[PDB]
Write a protein that binds this ligand. Structure first.
Ligand SMILES: [Zn+2]
Ligand SMILES: [Zn+2]
Ligand SMILES: [Zn+2]
Ligand SMILES: [Zn+2]
Length: 140
DNA sequence: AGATTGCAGCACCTGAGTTTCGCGTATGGTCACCCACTACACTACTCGGTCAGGCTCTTACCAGCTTAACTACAGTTGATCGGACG
């Protein structure tokens, strides 16, 4: 895989000056300046569904760090991008919309009908230690 | 009534119709081995983004002046706007 990407598919080289760069990111920045079109805003947001464009690389660095920070779900630690990403993923845990089933983390048999009732099993066969966070998190 | 002779009865070697058999030749059947394909979960090296380090370029200068434009003061006229008409 490395041989193909270093002897035949020269993807890390400039299309114009024939320098090369240690990551595609720096090649992109290089093309955006040293071989740039007459465009006023040489930088464009690299992320999903974002259409914004910028004059100086520092403003793009700021925009990525502000509006596309890479987060982990507070409950399930799965990664997501930006405020919308977190708010979209938080629906999955929501007990008002997602009228989910109720089970033990270990015991195969459980089949509760309400959240308060599920805490009886975790309060007796387990205890207040090693209950799952989605059950515990009365955060709203 | 004897010398010549046939009948036919005895016994033992022999022959086929009939049978049981052995094998060929070949066929369906047991079952043991090991192969091919598939696949859930995994191993591990690379690529990639991000960050620092610190060497690097390039700015534009102080008050004044002296080369260059605006940036406020200013006046009659627009035609959206309110709110009420059709
Ligand atoms: Zn180049
Ligand atoms: Zn963006
Ligand atoms: Zn979550
Ligand atoms: Zn249990």
């Amino acid at each position: 895989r490395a041989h193909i990407l270093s002897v035949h598919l020269h993807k890390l080289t400039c299309p114009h000056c024939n320098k090369s760069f240690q990551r595609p990111y720096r090649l992109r920045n290089h093309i955006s300046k040293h071989h740039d079109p007459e465009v006023e805003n040489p930088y464009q947001c690299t992320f999903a569904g974002c259409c914004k464009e910028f004059r100086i690389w520092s403003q793009l660095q700021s925009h990525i760090k502000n509006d596309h920070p890479k987060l982990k779900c507070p409950i399930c630690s799965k990664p997501c991008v930006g405020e919308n990403g977190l708010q979209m993923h938080m629906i999955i845990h929501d007990d008002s919309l997602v009228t989910k089933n109720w089970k033990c983390h270990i015991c195969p048999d459980m089949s509760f009908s309400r959240k308060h009732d599920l805490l009886t099993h975790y309060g007796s066969i387990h205890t207040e230690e090693d209950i799952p966070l989605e059950l515990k998190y009365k955060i709203s």
